[PDB]
Amino acid sequence: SDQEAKIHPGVTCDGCQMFPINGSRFKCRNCDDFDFCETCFKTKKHNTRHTFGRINEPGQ
Ligand SMILES: [Zn+2]
Ligand SMILES: [Zn+2]
């Protein structure tokens, strides 16, 4: 089984508009409703004082 195959239904990556996010999902703990896919999480600029929660699969 492959983490990249996991999808998060209804979740858009705000960095690249991927929908649904596949792979691990990174939800910002400070923004109201902001998510990154993993590539965007590693490469896009974001408030350096915000912290993201890693959600590998729906329900976490
Ligand atoms: Zn993305
Ligand atoms: Zn944020």
Swiss-Prot record:
Zn(2+) 1 binds at C13, C16, C37, C40. It comes from Homo sapiens. It is linked to Intellectual developmental disorder, autosomal recessive 38: A disorder characterized by significantly below average general intellectual functioning associated with impairments in adaptive behavior and manifested during the developmental period. MRT38 is characterized by global developmental delay affecting motor, speech, adaptive, and social development. Patients manifest autistic features, aggression, self-injury, impulsivity, and distractibility. The chain holds residues 2702 to 2755 of 4834 of the full protein. Zn(2+) 2 binds at C28, C31, H46, H50. Sumoylated with SUMO1 by PIAS4 in response to double-strand breaks (DSBs), promoting the interaction with RNF8. The ZZ-type zinc finger mediates binding to SUMO1, and at low level SUMO2. The RCC1 repeats are grouped into three seven-bladed beta-propeller regions. E3 ubiquitin-protein ligase that regulates ubiquitin-dependent retention of repair proteins on damaged chromosomes. Recruited to sites of DNA damage in response to ionizing radiation (IR) and facilitates the assembly of UBE2N and RNF8 promoting DNA damage-induced formation of 'Lys-63'-linked ubiquitin chains. Acts as a mediator of binding specificity between UBE2N and RNF8. Involved in the maintenance of RNF168 levels. E3 ubiquitin-protein ligase that promotes the ubiquitination and proteasomal degradation of XPA which influences the circadian oscillation of DNA excision repair activity. Interacts with XPA. Interacts with NEURL4. Via its interaction with NEURL4, may indirectly interact with CCP110 and CEP97. Changing C13S: Abolishes binding to SUMO. This is E3 ubiquitin-protein ligase HERC2. A zinc finger (ZZ-type) spans 8-60. It is found in: Cytoplasm; Cytoplasm, Cytoskeleton, Microtubule organizing center, Centrosome, Centriole; Nucleus.
